[PDB]
Design a protein around this ligand. Structure first.
Ligand SMILES: [Zn+2]
Ligand SMILES: [Zn+2]
Length: 55
């Protein structure tokens, strides 16, 4: 398949319809609403690059 798109740096699951992926403004890296939340647990920023979302 086309393994060249938005990969979840947390669960690494092809972002498909039915989930709530959250993309950030600094970069746009799209992650899951669930993985992006468990990935926070302290880091309030993007999990792949680390571009905080709050200004
Ligand atoms: Zn995920
Ligand atoms: Zn990012």
């Amino acid at each position: 398949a086309m393994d060249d798109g938005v990969e979840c740096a947390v669960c690494l699951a092809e972002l498909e319809d039915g989930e709530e992926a959250r993309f950030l403004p600094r970069c746009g890296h799209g992650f899951h609403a669930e993985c992006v939340d468990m990935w926070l647990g302290s880091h309030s920023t993007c999990p792949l690059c680390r571009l905080t979302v709050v200004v």
